[PDB]
Structure formats: structure tokens, C-alpha cells
Write a protein that binds this ligand. Structure first.
Ligand SMILES: [Ca+2]
Length: 208
């Protein structure tokens, strides 16, 4: 039960769960949640809240969908903004992004602290300093921005960033598209495949 169950993937690693995969954790209000643990990357104990790999799941979804979460444990998913808030509520948390391009090259980015506020604060992003990574720093000008979806424009642009990129994100100005954008499905031989920060994305969190 909640009293003796784990709170996140770090707890699970401590209890001797050394393989990546889906496990039950208990949120701070004791709601059980099935989450994806990354037990291999950068010491392990990461809870994965976004994963894309093939563009099979539609990410151009409304506020309610992003709030609750959507997709498949067997594939691509967004864990849900209520859930991401719950995971980053207690204590301090670190963010990691892992990316794979179409030629098999692995890249990454790491951030000191990562919090998303509750729905009353439009799931505002509270992001710490870029700690480093080969993928580069793309979430630099995103700190303090509200979350935006197609039906809820909370950006600081005259346009609807979510519509214009076709995905939901903590948009400010929208000069480029993000990890939740269109997953291009063009000829296998061309550049017009994947997403921008390109074949694979994973966003994940761990106690700092
Ligand atoms: Ca706008």
C-alpha cells in the first residue's frame, strides 16, 4: 500500500530494481501511478514523463488531454501535467532530456532543477540552470512560462504558438518547434522526418 510503497523511480532503484520498465509508485496523496523508470542512463532512477520514437501517437491535443496524459506504455506517451506536477512537488528535482537522431547518434541535456506548478498556475515551468549536455541548451528562454495548448493560448506571442507548431509546450515567443511538435513523416531518405529540439525523445526527472 501507500505507506510502504515507493514514491518514484529513485526509491525503486534503492530497493533493487535495476532494469528499466513500468512500475507502480505512489503519488503524495497516495494515488497509485504506473510510471516508466530509466534505471540505466546517467546512474538510473529517472522517472520518464515523455517519450516519442515513431510518430504513431498524435501529440496535437487539447488542454484536458495534456492534463490527464495520453498515449501508450508500449510506445509514445505524455505522462500528464497533474502527474508531472505531483512528481516535482515534494523536495527538489533534476531534469534530463535524451535524444537520438536518425543516424543513431545519442545526445542529451541536463538541468539543475525542474518544477511544474499546479493547474491554477497554468502548469507554469520553473527551470534551473543548464548543467550541460551534447544536445545543447534549448529550454533556456522557457523558464517561468505557462503551459499552452491549441485551445488555451497562454504564451506571450500575438500568434497561437501551439497551433503554429502543432503541439503543446511552455511557449514564450515561438521561434522554433519543440519535443511535443509535429513528428514529420516524409520519405525515408529525406530530412523531413522526426522532431526538433530527432528520431527519439525522452524527458525524465529524479530527486536532486
Ligand atoms: Ca498568443
Amino acid at each position: 500500500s501507500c505507506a510502504t510503497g515507493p514514491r518514484n523511480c529513485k526509491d525503486l532503484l534503492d530497493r533493487g530494481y535495476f532494469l528499466s520498465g513500468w512500475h507502480t509508485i505512489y503519488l503524495p496523496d497516495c494515488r497509485p501511478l504506473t510510471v516508466l523508470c530509466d534505471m540505466d542512463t546517467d546512474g538510473g532512477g529517472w522517472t520518464v514523463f515523455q517519450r516519442r520514437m515513431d510518430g504513431s501517437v498524435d501529440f496535437y491535443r487539447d488542454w484536458a488531454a495534456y492534463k490527464q496524459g495520453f498515449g501508450s506504455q508500449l510506445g509514445e506517451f505524455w505522462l500528464g501535467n497533474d502527474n508531472i506536477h505531483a512528481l516535482t512537488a515534494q523536495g527538489s528535482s533534476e531534469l534530463r532530456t535524451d535524444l537520438v537522431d536518425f543516424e543513431g547518434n545519442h545526445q542529451f541535456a541536463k538541468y539543475k532543477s525542474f518544477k511544474v506548478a499546479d493547474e491554477a498556475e497554468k502548469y507554469k515551468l520553473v527551470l534551473g540552470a543548464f548543467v550541460g549536455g551534447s544536445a545543447g541548451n534549448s529550454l533556456t528562454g522557457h523558464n517561468n512560462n505557462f503551459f499552452s495548448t491549441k485551445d488555451q493560448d497562454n504564451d506571450v506571442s500575438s500568434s497561437n504558438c501551439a497551433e503554429k507548431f502543432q503541439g503543446a509546450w511552455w511557449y514564450a515567443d515561438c521561434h522554433a518547434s519543440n519535443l511535443n511538435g509535429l513528428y514529420l513523416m516524409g520519405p525515408h531518405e529525406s530530412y523531413a522526418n522526426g522532431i526538433n529540439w530527432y528520431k527519439v525523445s525522452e524527458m525524465k526527472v529524479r530527486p536532486a
